[PDB]
Every structure is written in C-alpha cells, then in structure tokens.
Amino acid sequence: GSATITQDTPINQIFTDTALAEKMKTVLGKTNVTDTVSQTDLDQVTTLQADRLGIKSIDGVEYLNNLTQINFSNNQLTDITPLKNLTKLVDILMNNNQIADITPLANLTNLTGLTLFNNQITDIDPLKNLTNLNRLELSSNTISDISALSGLTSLQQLSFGNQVTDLKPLANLTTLERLDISSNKVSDISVLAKLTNLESLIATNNQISDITPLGILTNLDELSLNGNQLKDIGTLASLTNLTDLDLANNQISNLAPLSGLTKLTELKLGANQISNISPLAGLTALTNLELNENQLEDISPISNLKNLTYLTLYFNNISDISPVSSLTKLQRLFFYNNKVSDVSSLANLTNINWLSAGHNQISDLTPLANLTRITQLGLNDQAWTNAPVNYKANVSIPNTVKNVTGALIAPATISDGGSYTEPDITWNLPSYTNEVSYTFSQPVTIGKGTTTFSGTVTQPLK
Ligand SMILES: [Ca+2]
C-alpha cells in the first residue's frame, strides 16, 4: 500500500513528466530535476497544488505516500493509476482533465471531497464505497447511470452529468443541501421530494414539466429550472423561503403562484409565455427581474418594484416603457425588440449604465442626453411605418430623426431615387407606388457607451 525508493534517486527518474518534475523540484527544495531525493524527502509532502501545469502523467506520485490533499485540475491527465494506494487522501481536485477510468479511486475511502467535473467519465461504479464523501462534483462528464451514488449518504453537495434520466438513486441522500443536475435528460424529479434538506436546487437544461415534487421542499432558498418544459408553477407557492428563482426558457404564462414569494430578490422569467405581470407587484424586494422574450404589452405592475437595479424586457410587444421611470435605482435596462417610440420617460434614470433599445420605433434620442453614466449602449435598427399618405408623382415628407444633441440626422439611403434637402425627403415617382422608405445610420456615444442609432422608416402611399 506504499511505494518507496530504497536509495536516493533523481527527481526526474521518479516524476517522469517534465512539468511535474519541475514542480516537485520546487516542492522538495532542490535546485535541479536531476538532483536526488530520498524517501524521507518524499514523506514530507502532504499536499500538492499542481493545477494548470501542462502535466500529462502523474507517474511518481505513488511515492508521496503521505498525501492528504491534491490538486491536479486543468491538466491533460488520462491515467490516474498512481493514486490507487494513496489512502490518506481526503480531498482531490481533478476537474478539467481527460480522465475516463476512475477505478484507481475505489479504495480511497478517506475521501471527503472529490472534484472530477469536465472529464470523460461514464462509469462511476468506483465511487460506490466512498461513503465519507461530503462533496462530489461530476458535472460535464458522460454519466448516464447514478446507481453508484446511492450509498453516499454523507453527501452535502452533489453535481453530475450529462446523460442521466433516472434520479431514484438519490432517494436516501437526505443530507444533500446543494444539488446541481444541470444538463441531463431528466423529466421525473419525484425523488427530489425526499431531499427535504435541500437549500439550493439547480436543475437547468433538462426535460422537466412536472414540479409538484418540489412542494414540500420548503428549505429551498435558491431554485433554478431554466431550460425545461414548465407551464404550471402552482407548486412554487409553497416555497416561501425562495430568494433567487430562475424559470427562464420554459412555457409559463400564470405567475399567480409567485405572488406570495416576497423574499425574492432575483427573479428570472425570460423566454416564457407571460402576458401579465400583476402577480409580481408585491415582490418589492426584487433587485433583478428578467422578463425578456414574453408576450408583454402593458408593464405597469413593475411600478411598485422600487428596488430594481436590473431589468430585461427585450422581445416583447411593449409600446409604453414609461413604468420604468418609477425605478430610480435602475442601472441596466434592456428593451430591444419592442414597439417603443418615445423614450422621454427615461430622461431622469441617472443611474443607468447599460441601455439597450435596438429594434424599437425610436426617432428622438434627446431624452437620453443626461444619462452620462452610460457605459454600454444599443440603439440599432429601429423600424417603423408612418401613417399612410396619398401617392403623388411628387411626394415629400419631413425628417424627424434626432440625435442625442437634438440635431437632425440626415438620411443614409432613400428609396425610389428620392433625395434630401434638410429637412425634407422628396421623391419623384413616375407612376403609383404602394410605399417609399429611407434609412438613417448614425454612430453615437452617450457617456462612454457607443452604438449606431439607425433605422428604416416606411412610408405607405394610398
Ligand atoms: Ca443576489
């Protein structure tokens, strides 16, 4: 159960990997990799921090019999056979290698922490007797079967991926406080109802539609179900200790179950089917609210959310952005891809650092002029259609497009051979045309944020 050298031996004949030898030379207090070391020298090494060293082999590590902690994360390891007898090991950090075979860990029963995420592990049967584990991190592997976890009843933190469908091996792991099952193939989370000490559940990018198992998990303070197939979230009414909730990328329309979750400070509901946010009006502790990619038109319920610093509303059908004027603390406001044609209500949101409002109907930047704390800005690709007008071989309309300074922005292009003499855009149309149009395109900076303010304007002809 111990590898030893019988005579003093050069470091580079024990640690055959170039990078590891160089590291061990420093650890062992030698001045060259050809210098000899004794077994006594080797016996004094109890921890090894050898992360991000370009190590391809840990050959030699078997002679460090007294190791209790190792970090070989972010290397190029495949074979970990040298660990097989290092039974004093308590903690291993070995994420971000190319390890597939973890059979060498099977007898390391004093392990309490094991980090193996970002490897090429499928078979975790070697973990089954590591019952003193309190932390096990296996995300971003190719695990499809977690049967081996079923006896790891001291686990407090667990993550794994990326093939799992059957979570039933978790049933007896009631010591679990933090679980991350992101990026698996799970639909059935019934077993989670047994994990009543869970405080944090991250279950993103799965196939979950039924969350009724969560009903009794009232110790949850953090929950993420981003990227599933949720619609009915009635169960969440029970989870009154939630402070951070992510339900983005689902099919939710009815937010009433959230209305009593008044300890929420962060609520992420992007990419759902929400047309009404009245149930959020009482959630006044919210600082971060995401409502992008929904069916919103009216947003007046945000008016009471006075502590909002961050707000997303992009990809809705909002005409009236003005409720955001109630949010003095607002720092980031994204509402690109809406129908907003007036930003006058933003003029006093002096704390805004990030304003992103492309793909609206904005023609006049002057209300933004005193937003000098802006450091990121987006104003691309406005588009709108004027009220119809009566054809006319000779047709003329005024330019309304204003930069942040108040200056008119000259058209960049004009359709149907049309021309510009400030402020008039003038066409000569041989015969009847159903529409004419023009574009503008103006780089602009406010504060330190730079963008191009641009658009395409369509003029119907009757
Ligand atoms: Ca927070």
Name all contacts of 10-13 with Cβ < 8 Å and 24+ positions apart: 10/34, 10/35, 10/36, 10/37, 11/35, 11/36, 11/37
The answer to whether the beta carbons of residues 302 and 329 sit under 8 Å apart is no
Q: Which CATH architecture has domain 382-462?
A: Sandwich (2.60)
Give the amino acid at 250. N
Across 272-282, b (16+ Cβ under 10 Å) vs e yields bebebbebbeb
Looking at domain 1-381, its CATH class is alpha beta
* Å from CA of 10 to ligand 1 middle: 52
Rounded to an integer, what distance in angstroms lies between the CA atom of residue 433 and that of residue 461?
7
CA of 26 to the centre of ligand 1 (A): 41
Ligand 1 centroid vs 223 CA: distance in angstroms?
13
Report CA(349)–ligand 1 centroid distance (Å): 22
Cα(266) to ligand 1 centroid in Å equals: 6
For the chain, how big is the Rg over CA atoms in Å?
Answer: 31
Integer CA distances (angstroms), 58 to 78, 84, 136, in order: 9, 12, 22
d(CA 302, CA 110): 53
Beta bridge partners of 9: 37
Instruction: Give all strands of the β-sheet with 435-446 in edge-to-edge order.
Output: 382-385, 449-460, 435-446, 413-414
| Rounded Cα–Cα distance for residues 198 and 200 (Å) | 6
Dist. CA 250 → ligand 1 center (Å): 22
Cα(165) to centroid(ligand 1), Å: 31
Report CA(264)–ligand 1 centroid distance (Å).
Answer: 10
- What DSSP string describes 404-420? TTSPBPPPSEESTT-EE
For residue 234, report the phi and psi dihedrals to the nearest 5 degrees: -50, -40
Q: Which residues pair with 158 in a beta bridge?
A: 136, 179
- The structure tokens listed for 363 are 């023609």
**Specified resolution (Å):** 1.5
- Per the CB < 8 A criterion, the answer to whether 281 and 301 are in contact is yes
With CA atoms as reference, report the closest residue to 53 among 63, 45, 61: 61
Instruction: Output the CA 453–ligand 1 centroid distance in Å.
Output: 33
Reading the block at residue 336, the tokens are 């690109």
Which of 31, 41, 56, 55 minimizes the C-alpha distance to 9? 41
Per-domain residue ranges of the chain: 1-381, 382-462
Bridge partners of residue 162, in order along the sequence: 143
Listed residue (267, 209, 225) closest to 242, CA to CA: 267
- Compute, in angstroms, the gap from residue 426 CA to the centroid of ligand 1: 54
User: How far away, in angstroms, is 246 Cα from ligand 1 center?
Assistant: 12
Residue 146 tokens read as 């977690």
Say how many residues make up the chain: 462
| Span from the CA of 352 to the centroid of ligand 1 (angstroms) | 19
Distance 459 CA to ligand 1 centre (A): 47
Strands 413-414, 435-446: pairing is antiparallel
Q: DSSP letters along 38-73, please?
A: -HHHHHT--EEE--SS-----TTGGG-TT--EEE--
Return the H-helix or E-strand segment holding 26.
Answer: helix 18-27
Spacing, Cα 326 to ligand 1 middle (Å): 21
Q: Cα(219) to centroid of ligand 1, in Å?
A: 18
Residues 203 and 177: their CA atoms lie apart, in Å, by 14
What is the Å distance from ligand 1's center to 243 Cα?
8
**Furthest C-alpha separation in the chain:** 103
> Do residues 152 and 133 make contact, with C-beta atoms less than 8 angstroms apart?
yes
